[PDB]
């Protein structure tokens, strides 16, 4: 057990609610680089072509914003790889 | 009240004259960083998920042709995300 | 008259041929960064808001290829713009 | 003869399974870039726009995971690029 792994696999479930509340742990404790790594890991892996390419979009925006900023394109990341076939 | 906000709020209200009106003026004053910053955040906030994954690869057009020629790309996301859902 | 303008119009102009003949010559001259700049200017200026957003991908694999196999890349994109709607 | 444009063949000739058996030799030799370039050339050369733009995407977040993650991406684009 630790958060960044919670985190992946509550996204494999397709849990939104779960998915976010790690995703705020994730960004106030502020390393912004496992979290983008994790999303692309799991766009690619778990997830919808058009998903996954948006997934390294979402990550760049998440990088050139940086945090707190950064939340906005990683929730939207979360939810879309959340809700994705 | 602030140019970059009114700006913003422009595009939330889908309103495209004024929304360039304000991205002519921050070109004028070349804050190519505030420009991208807030089209990226109203992408992913405000907004249609390959809307919001176009907004990234506007900015990138942006920042590689840089200013002036970086209006080009901008006015173009300015539009799209004004007329977006 | 300029070759680089040249292009630019037959890409406005929606015709392949010309855009590729202007290209190829483009490409052999070899000043990648002038091609790439203003593919971005005309995917953004004259073009298809998905076609627009595909040229940046382009000028980024054609700034990892390299000369000479940034064409690749390039080609396929003058062809999308000159074929997309305006 | 040698894996990289047999890597390439059997992606032109849409024969996932050699494909993916290239690519983890090609993971397993460590070298990231020649892997990259081919993957981008064979989407725009040999390829939708939109799977030729989306090759890209992938060979961003291979080199920004660097192997052995980017194998993840890499696989993805192989199977993509295959069908």
Known sequence: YDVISAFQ????????????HYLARLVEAGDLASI???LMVIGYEDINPAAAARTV????????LGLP????????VVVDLCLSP
């Not at 696999?9 to 976010?20: C, F, P």
């Not at 979009?57 to 050139?64: D, F, P, Q, S």
């Not at 900023?69 to 939207?76: F, K, S, T, V």
């Open 57 to 64: 979009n979402a990550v760049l925006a998440a990088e050139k």
């Open 9 to 20: 696999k509550s996204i494999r479930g397709s849990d939104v609610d779960a998915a976010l």
């Open 69 to 76: 900023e950064a939340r906005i394109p990683l929730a939207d």
């Open 36 to 38: 983008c790594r994790r």
